[PDB]
Amino acid sequence: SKEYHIDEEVGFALPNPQENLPDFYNDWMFIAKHLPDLIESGQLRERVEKLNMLSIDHLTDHKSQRLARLVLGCITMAYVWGKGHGDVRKVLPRNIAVPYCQLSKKLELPPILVYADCVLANWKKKDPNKPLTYENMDVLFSFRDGDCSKGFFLVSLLVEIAAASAIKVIPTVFKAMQMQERDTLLKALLEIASCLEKALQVFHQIHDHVNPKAFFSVLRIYLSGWKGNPQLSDGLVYEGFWEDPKEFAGGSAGQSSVFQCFDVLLGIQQTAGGGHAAQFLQDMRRYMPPAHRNFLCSLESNPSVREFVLSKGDAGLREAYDACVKALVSLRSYHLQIVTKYILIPASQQGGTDLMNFLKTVRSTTEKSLLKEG
Ligand code: HEM
Ligand SMILES: O=C(C[C@H]1c2c(F)cccc2-c2cncn21)C1CCCCC1
């Protein structure tokens, strides 16, 4: 690990995100910081239409470009979805479409709000001298009062951070395989397994800070994109940048690099085959930051832990390897239950089976990677 932009303490998330942009962009940040009130009063759309076209030249360093991608992506969701009741904008105005697209191509991400914007760069500690717990943290932007974006974003972030403790171990895994250092490889695999077990505890916080009706009827609407979306059949037009409408996927934790990297690490071939699930997870790698995508490619080019463990006729190693797969299955089983409570039951009024089918395919693939199981 070196220039993969992966942090010791926080992993794939952006370390200590910038909260303020240069004063040259106070007109962007007034809108982003007040979307609850501006959306509800119906003045957001006119306020975005009335901004001038601001250059991206004053965004000098990485952290300010990431805040700007966050700021404009939030304004774009609000502009396109309005008050999230089904009356949508097919055109994004030039004054915000051009700088958003220019900044996006600079950072090699699509001009739509992605996971690495609203989770990995969308947080702050309340008091720097205290640890990274939900109580000492907060998001930087929200769409609507009571949309539960703080719970949803922050709990995803804390899971991402939990798993980041196991990322540190990955160089130990490959150095041990290369040097045939068997004892330290088994220690490495169980260390990876206990971090993934700790991350499962973090998942329980979702029930405390997100409620299903707000998630389903509100936050879901603002996280949606325009790829195969019937509300914008042809996609969104980026006035002044592409003449024709263009389709980009809405936010999806397939764009989280941390579960994709453990799939790669353990040889669970989630992107193998022609199926829709593999097709989808591969395409979501284009919505990850290039440093993290390059990291995934880098693990896929290392020797297979899985084939190393199978070739050695060593139970101890096989149990440690299964301890990691079991942790992943446990995570994905608990998360399928979240989705039953937060999407399936609300959708029937306390599409949906396409999502459940997707997650069960991923979990199935994972389950079938267990070794002396069957
Ligand atoms: C209210 C809570 C949640 C709901 C309703 C929910 C729902 C979903 C749905 C419907 C998908 C598949 C659709 C898609 O990604 O396009 C998905 C994928 C995924 N989600 Fe969540 N999720 C929630 C919480 C979380 C949290 C806190 C994490 C922590 C990082 C997470 C991690 C993932 C991952 C890694 C995937 C990719 C598929 C996989 O690796 O199994 N989810 N989620
Ligand atoms: O996958 C996602 C959203 C995605 C997401 C974000 F877009 C931003 C922050 C966290 C997540 C997240 C966590 N699990 C799925 N997702 C939606 C897909 C459509 C049904 C609602 C859930």
Extract the tokens encoding 91: 């055109």
| φ and ψ of 317, to 5 deg | -60, -45
Same domain, 97 and 180: no
237 — phi, psi (to 5°)? -90, 135
- By DSSP bridging, strand 124-125 and strand 91-92 are unpaired
Query: In which residue are the tokens 């709990």 written?
Result: 155
Q: Indicate if ligand 2 lies below 6 Å from the C-beta of 153.
A: yes
Between CA 136 and CA 131 the distance in angstroms is 7
Q: What residue owns the CA closest to ligand 2's atom 22?
A: 220
| Burial letters 289-326, b for 16+ CB under 10 A, else e | beebbebbeebeeeeebbebbbeeebeebbbbbbbbbb
Cα separation, 289 vs 307, in Å, equals 29
Neighbours of 123 (CB within 10 A): 24
Q: Which residues pair with 91 in a beta bridge?
A: 237
Closest CA to 112 of 296, 360, 287, 333: 287
Resolution (angstroms) stands at: 2.7
3-state secondary structure the chain: CCCCCCECCCECCCCCCCCCCCHHHHHHHHHHHCHHHHHHHCCHHHHHHCCCCCCCCCCCCHHHHHHHHHHHHHHHHHHHHCCCCCCCCCEECHHHHHHHHHHHHHHCCCCCCCHHHHCCCCCEECCCCCCCCHHHEECCCCCCCCCCHHHHHHHHHHHHHHHHHHHCCHHHHHHHHHCCCHHHHHHHHHHHHHHHHHHHHHHCCHHHHCCHHHHHHHHHHHCCCCCCCHHHCCCEEECCCCCCCECCCCCCHHHCHHHHHHHHHHCCCCCCCCCHHHHHHHHHHHHCCHHHHHHHHHHHCCCCHHHHHHCCCCHHHHHHHHHHHHHHHHHHHHHHHHHHHHHHHHHCCCCHHHHHHHHHHHHHHHHCCCCCCC
Please count the other Cβ atoms lying within 10 Å of the Cβ belonging to residue 140: 21
Count of domains observed in the chain: 2
Residues 12 and 100 in one domain: no
Q: How far apart are the C-alpha atoms of 367 and 330, rounded to whole Å?
A: 10
156 lines ligand 2 (CB under 6 A): yes
Distance CA 83, CA 40 (A): 7
Give the domain-ending residue among 182, 213, 248: 248
Cα–ligand 1 centroid distance for 337 (angstroms): 11
CA of 62 to the centre of ligand 1 (A): 27
Pairwise CA distance, residues 4 & 278, whole Å = 24
CA 222, 228, 233 angle in degrees (round to 5)?
90
* Cα–Cα distance for residue pair 335/347, rounded to 1 Å: 17
- Cβ-proximal residues to 28 (8 Å cutoff; 6+ apart), any chain: 21, 51, 54, 68, 71, 72, 75
CA torsion through residues 217, 220, 222, 225, sign: negative
Q: Structure tokens of 231? A: 């509300």
Same domain, 24 and 159: no
Both tokens of 105, joined, read 């191509």
**Residues 6+ away with beta carbon under 8 Å from 307:** 267
Cβ atoms of 366 and 234 within 8 Å: the answer is: no
Residues 266 and 347 in one domain: yes
Task: Say yes or no: 98 and 4 in one domain.
Answer: no
Please state, in angstroms and rounded to a whole number, the distance separating the CA atoms of residues 292 and 13: 10
Cβ–ligand 1 distance for 362 under 6 Å, the answer: yes
Q: Which residue has the tokens 């029930």?
A: 207
Which whole-number Å values give the CA distances from 176 to 146, 169, 258, 315, in the listed order?
49, 11, 22, 17
Q: Sign of torsion, CA 212 217 218 223?
A: positive
Clarify whether residues 140 and 195 are in a common domain. no
Identify which of 12, 143, 156 to mutate to test ligand 2's pocket (most ligand atoms within 8 A of the CB).
Answer: 156
Domain interval for residue 236: 18-145+224-248
Residue 244 and residue 330 in one domain:
no
Q: What residues contact 41, with CB distance under 8 A and at least 6 apart?
A: none
Nearest CA to ligand 2 atom 2: 252
* Statement to judge: residues 154 and 303 lie in one domain: yes
The closest-lying atom of ligand 2 relative to the alpha carbon of residue 250 is: 7
Flag whether 335 is marked binding. Answer: yes
Closest CA to 22 of 86, 89, 67, 72: 67
Place of tokens 């951070």: 161
Residues 233 and 216 in one domain: no
Question: Domain boundary at 209, 233, 248, which?
Answer: 248
Whether residues 282 and 182 share a domain: the answer is yes
Q: Is 362 in the same domain as 322? A: yes
Assess contact for 21 and 28: CB atoms under 8 A. yes
* 115 ligand 2 Cβ < 6 A: yes
By DSSP bridging, strand 137-138 and strand 124-125 are antiparallel
Question: How many angstroms does the Cα of residue 290 sit away from the middle of ligand 2?
Answer: 20
Among 289, 167, 143, 283, which Cα is nearest to 223's? Answer: 143
Q: What CATH number has the domain bearing residue 344? A: 1.20.58.480
Tokens of 103: 């900044």
Look-up of token digits 């926080």: 10
| Beta carbons within 8 Å of 102's beta carbon, 6+ residues apart | 56, 241
- Residues 82/130, Cβ–Cβ less than 8 Å: no
Domain boundary among 248, 281, 307: 248
Q: How far apart, in whole angstroms, are the C-alpha atoms of residue 118 and residue 73? A: 9
Are 95 and 232 contained in the same domain? yes
Give the residue from 166, 155, 164 showing the smallest Cα distance to 202: 155
Cα–Cα distance, 65 to 301 (Å, whole number): 30
Mutational pocket test of ligand 2: of 210, 252, 344, 362, the residue with most ligand atoms within 8 Å of the beta carbon: 252
